């Protein structure tokens with residue numbers, strides 16, 4: 369079984385990312401011990417808990433079930449014992465997250481290139497939606513760069529499977545949520561759907577066009593519009609109010625009108641009036657072709 373990875377043969381090379389409930393490492397899986405093994409990505413939990421383990425087992429199954437060019441490849445699992453600790457083994461994408469890649473190569477990345485990535489996220493997302501999976505955490509930090517011409521959705525920590533009788537999923541936290549990417553209904557009602565993923569995709573489109581400018585980030589922009597003198601529970605309250613009164617993220621500098629319109633349509637307060645991923649890709653591909661030859 370290739371899907372079974374022996375723990376003693378997984379050489380730690382570097383920590384890549386940390387989460388509230390886990391981490392991602394760069395390892396070399398070297399069974400022959402001759403230093404010819406491939407470098408892989410290893411996601412692991414930080415809290416031993418049964419409720420976080422169950423969520424993680426569900427996440428492993430969601431990823432195992434995904435086969436697309438714009439989705440990070442599942443490679444296998446790593447067990448240690450009977451009740452174990454469990455590790456998810458994925459392919460290593462060398463250019464890091466889309467957030468870090470863009471932040472460093474802003475001079476090299478055209479608008480056409482940004483739109484090629486956008487279309488790839490849309491295609492990956494539409495594929496998710498056919499399996500009735502809700503991502504719930506669409507952001508540039510969660511998109512990986514395989515190469516200069518290809519991005520993949522690279523983390524599924526918050527992904528949920530829709531119940532068979534509903535088109536939304538209601539879910540809590542319990543700690544810190546990525547609020548500045550959340551749809552109003554996710555803020556008020558805790559409702560997650562394909563439509564709230566579209567809302568968040570809008571924020572991703574925003575991120576990409578700001579070229580990750582710290583002063584222009586979604587938390588920074590929203591906090592200015594709210595008042596940086598705001599508490600904690602009040603931050604969600606005021607954010608709900610601003611969104612409700614058609615308060616939105618500004619058009620990023622240099623961003624064309626056609627693209628900001630895509631963003632604003634993704635940001636419709638009316639769940640049902642938001643575009644579909646298929647149409648999103650269609651408009652994006654159309655714009656890419658108008659900008660090119």
Ligand SMILES: COc1cc(F)c(CC(=O)N2CCN(c3nc(Nc4cc(C)n[nH]4)c4cccn4n3)CC2)c(F)c1
Pocket residue numbers: 384385386387389390391392409411440458459460461462463464465509510512522523
């Ligand atoms: C609970 O664990 C998580 C999961 C997350 F998605 C994030 C989100 C986030 O911020 N990053 C930034 C750093 N990063 C990264 N990854 C690379 N390669 C890779 C990752 C995979 C699966 N395959 N290949 C790579 C190559 C070069 C530099 N990097 N940097 C990982 C994701 C976390 F922070 C924590």
